[PDB]
Design a protein around this ligand. Structure first.
Ligand SMILES: Cc1ncc(COP(=O)(O)O)c(/C=N/[C@H]2C[C@@H](C(=O)O)C[C@H]2C(=C(F)F)C(F)(F)F)c1O
Ligand SMILES: Cc1ncc(COP(=O)(O)O)c(/C=N/[C@H]2C[C@@H](C(=O)O)C[C@H]2C(=C(F)F)C(F)(F)F)c1O
Ligand SMILES: O=C(O)CNC(CO)(CO)CO
Ligand SMILES: O=C(O)CNC(CO)(CO)CO
Lengths: 402, 402
């Protein structure tokens, strides 16, 4: 069963909601992936930063295999013995009172919106159903009707309305706009990514996150930080907001929370917010199941025990330093923090980010474009400096082969 | 670490969005669960019908263990070698052109709403953003802002607005109301459960589903059948709609699609609907990952090879027959199809569905109430007639001990 067979068969029987890069992967471990013909590749996408810990990390695998022989799902109608241990661990690890477990990133975001609105009505005293949540243009937090309603990307929302009311949108990295938006006492929260991933790794100016926290406190507005892709060592800290010593009111985690072995996500906040939701008022069939909790506990331990945040910090400097050695004729910008990085391609009609990624694949490195001029470079955080330097050679050899 | 310790620790560190039955489960297999003190129980909830195949079915476990050592997540940016095999299998199994894989039940529902609206705008010709979707009162399809906006249950939606526009609600099991609702040419779809699970196992009159299909065809409206809990042999057929030989335009699957080992869900429909969504316009980080696909393929094979639908059919008759032998003084109604069943309790102030389930737990059987007068009985479909008869004894011994 060849790569071409694999492409054709997905095309026949599967929805066309994606156009993947033409590579048919069968196997992966650490920083490497192998296709069906056995060719070996560096993974510079990390499955959108879900395999921070490397593919099939043995510690997380063994947690999965130990638990799958015991108990995988009771539903939340009864207690299991794993969920709390995970809850005690993750809430102490991040220093919040409580966690609400969900499965996917967008589910954690919907949860955060529901906490914000409920807190707005039952604590802040907003009249029912006047609550607003402010978002930054360029945000991406998933594909539900609610998530695309806050998007400014036409490919997310066009053809899918009517849209959820009560969302306001302001420019990203703009504190005067946030100050103007928070004049409305019916605003309950501001939700924002510490670095906008899908918008093309857009890093806000130093002090932005400190100013956000100040404005939210001053106006009695919840600061929701979406760390589903910036968190868990990807940017060189436990949370990207740690760079400015800022404590959000709600933190969203996902992707790397499981090492890529299970959809696990989390909403962290204190009691005065979390307990606004009463029993029966929110949940999920698979949220908090024992199998995902065991996996999450191990995937957090791997991040801590192997010191991947400081590894991501020190190697990201190296990565960005080498990438700017590329000629400004061809690479117009280098952006990133820790091991979440991007380069912008001077998109002539000679060439584009898609053709670059095709040739990168030919030379053994997997990455993928985000707007035809942007290419993300985000390898697993278990990569070593010598392995990283080999990868930079493949990027050099590719960019300069045009 | 005792059951009481387990309760207290979840209470301290976890959100209070649930009030589970006081039982702390550590282990499960087949139809049985064991708590931390070793006591053994019949599972008559099946984790809300996600473990149709029994807890930790060895065939599904071995599929998980084989794949977790190989590759668990590439993201949809590249191809993996498993996804298509699953897509070919499930689309031929249910006789639709295509499948769109997602993770949770509510994600499949949001997907169905987005397909319906997109089809309404790009095929039916509804002006943008006038599309409507009709739902039946009592529906439950999840906890996103969109899903609670169609709910008529105040505990789902109260305090969580403002709500998604464009949803109409009609009585369930009411064909004249549907005919009245579909007079609006801007309606794109009607979404409905063949049996309303969360509303208390509410079974519509014979012919209802045939009348729905006729009205939807006559008015050029998509018939979306939510089988996330009625499907996959739970009611005695592959799809609950199979009882009336009705083919919906969109079918939603979830829960049992994985055997309870992984959150896997699916949206099935033909090309003229499915291909309204173009690349980049919908997706999910974990949807379609190789690990969940291997698990789903095995969990479907277990349903087919062990003939659980006919087993569920023949044992559900037995179950409902015995349950009506209970005195009408105390059990006001018995409802269900296949192995999805409920009894209604004459809720005096002497006693209620919660106290019944407490005493059922004391006598070794796990079930749980849904509105304080309704108790669901839904054991795994691998149960045997002799095991089922033992369980009925525990239900008899409990109801008559009051
Ligand atoms: C900050 C943030 N909050 C929530 C979610 C929802 O999480 P989810 O519901 O998917 O679990 C996401 C998900 N982002 C995805 C979805 C995935 C895909 O489209 O396949 C590609 C991906 C992505 C990343 F991560 F950067 C990119 F390409 F869009 F740019 C997210 O980035
Ligand atoms: C027909 C249908 N369509 C979609 C979904 C969403 O699927 P999901 O997003 O959860 O994967 C569901 C989920 N129903 C759940 C959620 C779970 C919980 O509240 O913990 C209890 C449960 C339930 C069942 F199954 F009957 C009950 F108690 F609400 F009555 C569903 O029934
Ligand atoms: O009307 C618009 O332009 C947009 N309105 C919303 C976003 O601001 C929904 O998309 C309001 O929630
Ligand atoms: O206004 C209402 O009573 C309800 N409106 C909606 C449901 O019909 C949203 O909850 C419209 O989508």
């Amino acid at each position: 069963p060849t790569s071409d067979d694999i492409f054709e068969r997905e095309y026949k029987y599967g929805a066309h909601n994606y156009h993947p890069l033409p590579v048919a992967l069968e196997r992966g471990k650490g920083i490497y992936l192998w296709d069906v013909e056995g060719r070996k590749y560096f993974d510079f996408l990390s499955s959108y930063s879900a395999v921070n810990q490397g593919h099939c990390h043995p510690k997380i695998v063994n947690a999965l295999k130990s638990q799958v022989d015991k108990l995988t799902l009771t539903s939340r109608a009864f207690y299991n013995n794993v969920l709390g241990e995970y809850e005690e661990y993750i809430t102490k690890l991040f220093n919040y009172h409580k966690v609400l477990p969900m499965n996917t990133g967008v589910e954690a975001g919907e949860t955060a919106c529901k906490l914000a609105r409920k807190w707005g009505y039952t604590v802040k005293g907003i009249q029912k159903y006047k609550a607003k949540i402010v978002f930054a243009a360029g945000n991406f937090w998933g594909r539900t009707l609610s998530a695309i309603s806050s998007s400014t990307d036409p490919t997310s929302y066009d053809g899918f309305g009517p849209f959820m009311p009560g969302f306001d949108i302001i420019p990203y990295n703009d504190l005067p706009a946030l100050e103007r938006a928070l004049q409305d006492p019916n605003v309950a929260a501001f939700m924002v990514e510490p670095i906008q991933g899908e918008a093309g790794v857009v890093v806000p100016d130093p002090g932005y996150l400190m100013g956000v926290r100040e404005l939210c406190t001053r106006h009695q507005v919840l600061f929701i930080a979406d760390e589903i892709q910036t968190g868990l060592a990807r940017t060189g800290r436990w949370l990207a907001v740690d760079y400015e010593n800022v404590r959000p009111d709600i933190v969203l985690l996902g992707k790397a929370l499981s090492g890529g072995l299970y959809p696990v996500s989390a909403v962290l906040c204190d009691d005065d917010i979390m307990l606004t939701i009463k029993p029966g008022e929110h949940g999920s069939t698979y949220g908090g199941n024992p199998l995902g909790c065991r996996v999450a506990i191990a995937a957090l331990e791997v991040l801590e025990e192997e010191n991947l945040a400081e590894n991501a910090d020190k190697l990201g400097i190296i990565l960005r330093n080498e990438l700017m050695k590329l000629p400004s004729d061809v690479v117009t910008a280098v952006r990133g923090k820790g091991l979440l990085n991007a380069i912008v391609i001077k998109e002539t009609k000679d060439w584009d980010a898609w053709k670059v990624c095709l040739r990168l694949r030919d030379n053994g490195l997997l990455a993928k474009p985000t707007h035809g001029d942007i290419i993300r470079f985000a390898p697993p955080l278990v990569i070593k400096e010598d392995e990283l330097r080999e990868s930079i050679e493949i990027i050099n050899k590719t960019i300069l082969s045009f």
